[PDB]
Symmetry: D2
Subunit: 330 residues, 4 copies
Amino acid sequence: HHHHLPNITILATGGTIAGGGDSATKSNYTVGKVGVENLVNAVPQLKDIANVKGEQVVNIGSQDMNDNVWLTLAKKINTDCDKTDGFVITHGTDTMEETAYFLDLTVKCDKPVVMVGAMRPSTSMSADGPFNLYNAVVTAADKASANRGVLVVMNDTVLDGRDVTKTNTTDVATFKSVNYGPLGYIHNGKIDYQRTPARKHTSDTPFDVSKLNELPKVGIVYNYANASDLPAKALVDAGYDGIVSAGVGNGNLYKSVFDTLATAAKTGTAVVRSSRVPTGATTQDAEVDDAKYGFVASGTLNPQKARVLLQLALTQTKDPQQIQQIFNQY
Amino acid sequence: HLPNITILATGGTIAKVGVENLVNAVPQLKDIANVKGEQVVNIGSQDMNDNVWLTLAKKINTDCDKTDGFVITHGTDTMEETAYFLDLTVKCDKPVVMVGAMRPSTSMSADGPFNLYNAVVTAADKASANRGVLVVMNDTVLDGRDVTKTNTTDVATFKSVNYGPLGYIHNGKIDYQRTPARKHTSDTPFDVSKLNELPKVGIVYNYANASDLPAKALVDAGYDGIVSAGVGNGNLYKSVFDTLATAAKTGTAVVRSSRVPTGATTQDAEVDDAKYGFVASGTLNPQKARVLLQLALTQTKDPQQIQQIFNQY
Amino acid sequence: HHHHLPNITILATGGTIAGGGDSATKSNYTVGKVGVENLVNAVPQLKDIANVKGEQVVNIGSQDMNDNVWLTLAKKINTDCDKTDGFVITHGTDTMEETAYFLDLTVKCDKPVVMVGAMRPSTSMSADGPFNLYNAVVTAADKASANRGVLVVMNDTVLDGRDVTKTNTTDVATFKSVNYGPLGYIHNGKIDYQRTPARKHTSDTPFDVSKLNELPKVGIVYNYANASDLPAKALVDAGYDGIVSAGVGNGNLYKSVFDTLATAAKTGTAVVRSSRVPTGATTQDAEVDDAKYGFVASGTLNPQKARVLLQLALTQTKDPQQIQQIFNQY
Amino acid sequence: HLPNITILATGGTIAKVGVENLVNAVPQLKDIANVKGEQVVNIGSQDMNDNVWLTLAKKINTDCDKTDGFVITHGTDTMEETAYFLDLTVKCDKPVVMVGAMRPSTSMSADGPFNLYNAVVTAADKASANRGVLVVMNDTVLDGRDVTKTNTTDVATFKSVNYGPLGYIHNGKIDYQRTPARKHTSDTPFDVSKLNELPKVGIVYNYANASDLPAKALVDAGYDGIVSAGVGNGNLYKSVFDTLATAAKTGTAVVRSSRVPTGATTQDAEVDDAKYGFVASGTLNPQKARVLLQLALTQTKDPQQIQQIFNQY
Ligand SMILES: N[C@@H](CC(=O)O)C(=O)O
Ligand SMILES: N[C@@H](CC(=O)O)C(=O)O
Ligand SMILES: N[C@@H](CC(=O)O)C(=O)O
Ligand SMILES: N[C@@H](CC(=O)O)C(=O)O
């Protein structure tokens, strides 16, 4: 009997993991500049763990991530599923938590899909991307990684696509699942999994994007003292399918913003109350009578995460009670 | 002799209820201070606004020598904004301490009473002076610049997430170990004594496939400033970046902040702030950056002078 | 059809939840002074949620918690299981994380067992114990609480008995599951569970304490710069069954301490390497060759938690590989 | 002109490897300083000890005017202890910065290089002066009193868990926003210049059913001090409490600390410290409390004077 390594596919999309600057010590750099091959070759030990094949999907900063790249990824994973044992997606850190949740809801492939990035560019002293990529390959290769939904692997930690968020602007340790914690820790190329997400993911969702050319239009508005209603009115004037509110506290809205969203909701715009507060649920049965206005409470989904779910909810239904039920199940 | 402490009530879950009722509900306040209450407004802090800010700064500044310290009762939702506004505009050199409650007055294990007691402890402490406007919540004294609401329901929600608290309160005493270095109160140029309105500053949000429609609506209204809640280290979605690049050369100040809950939006990363005429917010989150941008716009419209204000206060 | 409330039993053991002082505003108090009845009557709304029956088991500060009270609790729960729908145990906060883990390993009753305490005494302004107790009753009454092991409920949060630990000396928010996060959050008397512990608990362990009169002797030694070997030698001289090391960093030992524990291990004393560091695993395959010395790595179990498991391991076996396997499964 | 910076190497994962190799591996150090390296010892910091502490304090104090600042390379396991010892005993008014690495030198994405660079940045910054002994790890400047190792393997492990960091390091610059209030360095009475050994102080651990055998072994050896790693707010298991109550009246100083990772061990809770002659450690964790108790025992054996040292440093 001979040892055979898993086949792992790296789908590259850009990010600081592929960024470069002209000094190892200066902070200035440009994103999404280095190709997949360079990234693979910067981690010689990948041969110890897997047979790795790189595909460049796009090469962008994830600040410019968009619906089309999401659709491209989910269809590619779902199409290529039987050709490989696992997927790693190199990606910018800025919107990784959004892509990860989109994929967590739309991937039907039953093989691990692991996202990874780097907070320091590839050119920098003590660059994090090499060891991150190695650890993402470890996770994508591990049989025990299956059936946990789509994953993010950063700073020696396996995180679920739903709860994972970027907590700090610069720290290599930025990614945390701030409400429910990580799924497992990685040491010496091995994972001790102690948790799995309970919310329904991947092949247990009704979201099927195989045939979609676009996603429903959903925007985000912020609340704060003396908040203008102009952002909200602009989305309503443009025929937006949905609006997510980054509320204050427990999903609360500045009155002007409330009035514009209450009206929009009456016309059939889906409105989700979320919170600019970085941890904790936007609950039902607090200061906003959601049933009355036809609003939906986002639970622990932050505004960018709630947008993902809301867009996907809007592909199945425009009924707010059914959208609320979706927000309670996925 | 006990210190004279004034409670300025503004609403919030800590009260709907009047200043007099909240005082009498904590009779042990009489052990530590002579408290007088005045009702400024009575609103949920989700409806906090510039007019209330101006009223508060003006009242503290004018009433400063009639009392030994102030406590401001406030909703928790925007307490972090009001605290930083007052941090930059209070000229009174006596402690100003904001407090709220995450549970209702009538709920099991309501936090308001002890929160109020400890806010008065803090306002009455001579060591609390010259530390800027403060927030006291969950036995902790927090500086008004860094303090933010971190959880939607936790009594322990308020934290100074970048630089930590100033001291902790135990048995009615504070062991202070820190003070903020950024200039505050009477060390700032902001003087709101004769202003009846503040520059219009709005906040836009970045995310994948972000619409430029919000940013355009602010530009079309002739907003004096726009704060971006960027992705990561203050980054902008291309459509948003395009609109703001235009606003910055067309009479609208642009501050890059971040939707990310901790850490600075830095210069010298991916964005050439000098080329576009943008200002990096540092550790000021979007709502905090709005406060400081509104006040900077009372002094100057020049990006470089705004960037220096953002580096000093 | 008529609504019937669950039957919940409160087993009282003491703690600050039952403490009292002479002022609502001064910090001084005495622990484990108030009886169960007073605690129940301080939460009038308990009638809305359950039929509550209180039993005083002991009335102590949990700084004086001990093996006999553990045995008393586990046997009482296992004996009384069919007489009630759920258990709440009021307890001091200081060693709640140890009792909770002991019960998580020894309770065979398939009904919820929820521990609760209070960081402020019952007499204090804004005392936390009333709402904590209410929330613990909510959790013990919830059908969805079953099969999650033994729980701690504090500060509106449901925490698993294994990972839960006291993080701060005074804060009402002190209890956190610092490695893997909480199981669910409580809002308006309802729980949204998103996680369950993967490590084996309750009726899936081999630990059966029904017949035990005592537990094996296991002590804890601390490491630091210039650490004395005298604590370790004292436990070895007394015939201790086990010793847990609160190591520095990744379970490392000051050399004098290492030498004494290496020798003890050769004579059949079980030695577990844990860490004084508050989060993260004490791993295998780092700076200590555990196989060589016959030592056991504690994983994420902190020293007091590792003591619990080690004592229970020693009731089944004295073989270090088998003890290591236990530390990898429970 | 670049500042002269001295690296004093002591071992740790950041190196086994010599001071000269570690320097040459980060050639960009030449952009910011003139670095000279000296090997003090070469050990895993799990074997750190009093002799090394004394060597380091003595060397810095004596070499202070020959250089512009010091960086000390050290294992991470007990860096938090060494930093606080030096915090209390360094009399040199130039920056002293400790640094280590959580990953080996030869591992993927080793943290040591950038950690070292940023430690030199910090040591070279004029603004770093008069802030006490520092720890620089993961782009963060941490005070030596509060800093502790919070995770067994994370590169981001070091945090000042009670009062937060002093500043963050970006693009070779520090934006300092805090400084420690507790007295340090040249504001302390501790003078180690002529000492060749330190008072014997041991640490005992509390947990359910705790043995008194460790505490008794220290008492029987005539230890000068015992620090208790208490449960909760510095509480003691009855057997341990009994033994320590005896030690405190029999020539052994007793400090109550806590195994709990954050927050103070307070007076005025469950334990009558005055009655027993005990000292409460405040936010000093057991290993930190040992450092300060050893140094207090060089000045006094009196519990009340020890309690005042614990309240000031
Ligand atoms: N702007 C970069 C940041 C990073 O990857 O760290 C991106 O998200 O593509
Ligand atoms: N909505 C309330 C929340 C609170 O005070 O806890 C307010 O901010 O006024
Ligand atoms: N010493 C008390 C502390 C508390 O309950 O909060 C106990 O553990 O019993
Ligand atoms: N055992 C090593 C750990 C490290 O340096 O990361 C030391 O402290 O010397």
